[PDB]
């Protein structure tokens, strides 16, 4: 909403564009989760890793449900059980235009994370 | 982070901003999942919400697994078996300044969306 506004009297700005500094905060902090995670899980998941080179990150790992139910301890299906993904709303920066006119611009983009095992209801 | 780069063979600004347009691209989206998703699923976990009002957006959801173990169709605790965490790398844009002087910069945080229940190692 207004978070990203300025107040009506403030000196103009070419094209209605707002002033984004350079850096990442804590560009360095790295996800840690279990090895093979997505195999290991009772509901287990694919990883297909999108790709945009007008994005940052260019990179974004979507997630898909391998089975319509979980596993159990023999390495069997039990589809009385479910699997469920988990989605984040997330903000990637798409960068616009060609030449010296570079400018960019936040997009929202759900992410499937994993998934999870339910009790159907 | 070379991304946010402008082609060397361009005439140099300030001290160094970009330009962020105004606008959320695919604003509109709202992640859809299972319902009580967090209390059905064999690993569940509980949400805590954290608040800044220089953070957009300004409520990042962090996520927490209830259990060691998972639990079973009886309702136990079964800690044969693992609750992890499933981590997302996100981005958060930052507001500095005041006023007209108002300025934005990206920030990643990582997220702690739910938890899956996985065999141990
Ligand atoms: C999940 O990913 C696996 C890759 O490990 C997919 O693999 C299956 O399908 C492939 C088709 O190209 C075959 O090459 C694989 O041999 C086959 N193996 C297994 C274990 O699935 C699998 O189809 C994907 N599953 C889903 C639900 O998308
Ligand atoms: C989740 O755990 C917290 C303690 O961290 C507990 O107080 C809360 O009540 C739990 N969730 C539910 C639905 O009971």
């Known amino acids: 909403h207004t978070f990203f506004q300025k107040p009506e009297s ?3 700005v070419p094209g209605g564009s707002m002033k984004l500094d350079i850096g990442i905060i804590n560009e360095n902090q790295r996800v840690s989760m279990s090895r093979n995670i997505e195999s290991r899980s009772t509901s287990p998941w ?4 999108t790709w945009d080179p007008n994005r940052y990150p260019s990179e974004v790992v979507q997630a898909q449900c391998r089975n319509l ?14 699997s469920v993904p988990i989605q984040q709303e997330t903000l990637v920066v798409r960068r616009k235009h060609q030449g010296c006119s570079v400018s960019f611009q936040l997009e929202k ?6 998934c999870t095992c339910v009790t159907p209801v």
């Not at 983009?109 to 994993?114: C, I, P, R």
């Open 69 to 82: 139910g979980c596993i159990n301890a023999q390495g069997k299906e039990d589809i009385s059980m479910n």
């Open 46 to 49: 694919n990883y297909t890793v």
């Open 10 to 12: 403030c000196p103009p």
């Open 109 to 114: 983009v759900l992410v499937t994370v994993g």
